[PDB]
Amino acid sequence: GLNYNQEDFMGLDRFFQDAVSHNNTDANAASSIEVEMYECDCMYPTFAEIARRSGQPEIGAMFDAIAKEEGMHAQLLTKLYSELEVKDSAETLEAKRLVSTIESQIDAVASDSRGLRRALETALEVETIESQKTYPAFAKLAAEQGNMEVATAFEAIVKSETKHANWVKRALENLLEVA
Ligand SMILES: [Fe+3]
Ligand SMILES: [Fe+3]
Ligand SMILES: [Fe+3]
Numbered sequence: 580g581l582n583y584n585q586e587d588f589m590g591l592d593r594f595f596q597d598a599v600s601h602n603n604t605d606a607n608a609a610s611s612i613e614v615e616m617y618e619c620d621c622m623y624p625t626f627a628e629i630a631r632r633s634g635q636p637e638i639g640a641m642f643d644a645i646a647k648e649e650g651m652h653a654q655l656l657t658k659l660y661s662e663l664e665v666k667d668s669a670e671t672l673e674a675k676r677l678v679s680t681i682e683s684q685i686d687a688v689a690s691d692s693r694g695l696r697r698a699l700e701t702a703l704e705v706e707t708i709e710s711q712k713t714y715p716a717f718a719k720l721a722a723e724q725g726n727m728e729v730a731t732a733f734e735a736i737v738k739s740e741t742k743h744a745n746w747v748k749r750a751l752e753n754l755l756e757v758a
Contacts (some may be wrong), residue, residue: 585736589688591697592740594622595676595705598661598713604721604729605663608656611717611736612665619650632689638750642702644686645743652736659729670739699751706747708738 586592596617598610623646630639657663667675688694718733734736 587686587701588680588691588697589695590677591694592701592704593677594625594674594698594701595599595708596622597708598670598717599668600713600716604717604724604726605719607717607727608660609663609665611661611714612653612656612660613645613647613667613671615653615656616665617648617667617671617674622647622705624648625681626702627630627691628685629689629694629698632685633692635695635696637755638695638754641746641750645702645746648739648743649721649748655732656729656737659732661705695754696751699747703744703747704753706740706744710737710744711715714740 596614598607598614601610623642627639627642630636630642640684685704714737717732718737719732721727721733722732
């Protein structure tokens with residue numbers, strides 16, 4: 580039938596952006612670079628600011644540390660595809676617009692305890708999808724195509740995103756435990 584669910588507070592869930600799947604590993608690298616750099620330079624810095632403005636500077640520092648590692652993921656792929664020209668898709672542009680909306684309301688976002696909770700839950704959502712679904716599938720196709728260096732790179736990114744997921748889960752557990 581019709582099956583309606585409330586959208587998340589402040590639309591914070593729409594910060595998650597999903598790399599697009601293609602037949603060709605060059606194109607999956609391009610899509611991954613695009614999302615990795617978006618997370619490095621837009622999504623995670625915004626989450627870090629939400630955390631700091633919420634009075635949670637340790638969680639802010641974790642998002643800053645994750646942001647740097649997303650940029651490492653992008654730079655590993657860029658090294659392997661030195662000539663690729665990466666442009667932001669409509670969906671990335673729309674995410675960056677949403678980022679700027681949140682930044683303009685950052686005090687209201689942070690003063691409600693949902694701001695940081697939903698930022699950590701969206702970070703967990705992307706780290707989960709990337710580590711368990713997207714990047715394993717990119718690794719598998721690269722290997723099928725005989726591109727061992729790129730398959731090995733995606734395998735390393737899988738392990739790194741898995742670590743991020745674990746950092747985010749521990750942070751969420753600590754945010755939610757008062758004492
Ligand atoms: Fe990522
Ligand atoms: Fe990444
Ligand atoms: Fe990550």
